[PDB]
Amino acid sequence: SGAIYVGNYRVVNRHLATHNDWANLVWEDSSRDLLVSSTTAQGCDTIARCDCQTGVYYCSSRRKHYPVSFSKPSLIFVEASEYYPARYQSHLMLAVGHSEPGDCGGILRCQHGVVGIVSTGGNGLVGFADVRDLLWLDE
Ligand SMILES: COc1cccnc1CC(=O)N1CCC[C@H](C(N)=O)C1
Ligand SMILES: [Zn+2]
């Protein structure tokens, strides 16, 4: 679990969005596993606007943060799960690091701010949904 709170927006994994997220929907994209909903309170986070390929993510299955080197956002094949058919997920960045299904939502940060959230993984890999291209989150 996990979310990014920026301005009057809440960013979550689309597959973990709640009834309240869908009732306050701003934007969603199944191909990116992202959903953004509106909030009444002002957020606590800020978004990186950079090309960093190193950062630190929170891993809830170890209660710890780990440093990672991650690939640029790209179209990556993701196996079928209980939430999606087998498909290409876009704007996804892979890294070597521990992750389990419940780790989705953990934040990845670089020195400039929030880069993305855990969205996929397996066998010593962890994949993050990028949010740095969503310029409208800041306005
Ligand atoms: C962090 O997730 C891990 C980690 C290790 C092993 N299986 C997972 C789960 C996983 O990859 N997915 C299930 C939920 C939806 C995901 C998606 N974006 O399509 C795919
Ligand atoms: Zn950065």
* Residue corresponding to tokens 């809440």: 10
User: How many Å apart are CA 131 and CA 118, to the nearest integer?
Assistant: 11
User: How many Å apart are CA 99 and CA 62, to the nearest integer?
Assistant: 9
User: How many Å apart are CA 61 and CA 6, to the nearest integer?
Assistant: 25
Stated resolution in angstroms: 1.5
- The residue whose CB lies within 8 Å of the most ligand 1 atoms, and thus the one to mutate among 61, 92, 94, 104, is 104
Query: Are 132 and 34 spatial neighbours (Cβ–Cβ below 8 Å)?
Result: no
Count the residues in the chain. Answer: 139
Residue 33 catalytic? yes
User: How many Å apart are CA 119 and CA 4, to the nearest integer?
Assistant: 13
DSSP codes, 37-102:
EE-SSPPS--B--S---EEEEEETTTTEEEEEEBPPSEEEEE---SSS-SEEEEEEEEEE----GG
128 lines ligand 1 (CB under 6 A): no
Alpha carbon separation from 63 to 3, 28, 58, 104, 132 (Å, rounded): 16, 29, 8, 13, 25
Residues with Cβ within 8 Å of 85's Cβ and at least 6 positions away in sequence, in order, are none
Boundaries of every domain in the chain: 3-44, 45-139
Number of neighbours of residue 112 by Cβ within 10 angstroms: 15
Technique used: X-ray
For 122, the token pair is 């397996």
Q: 40 alpha carbon to ligand 1 midpoint, in Å?
A: 30
Max CA separation in the chain (angstroms): 39
Classify residue 118 by its DSSP letter.
E
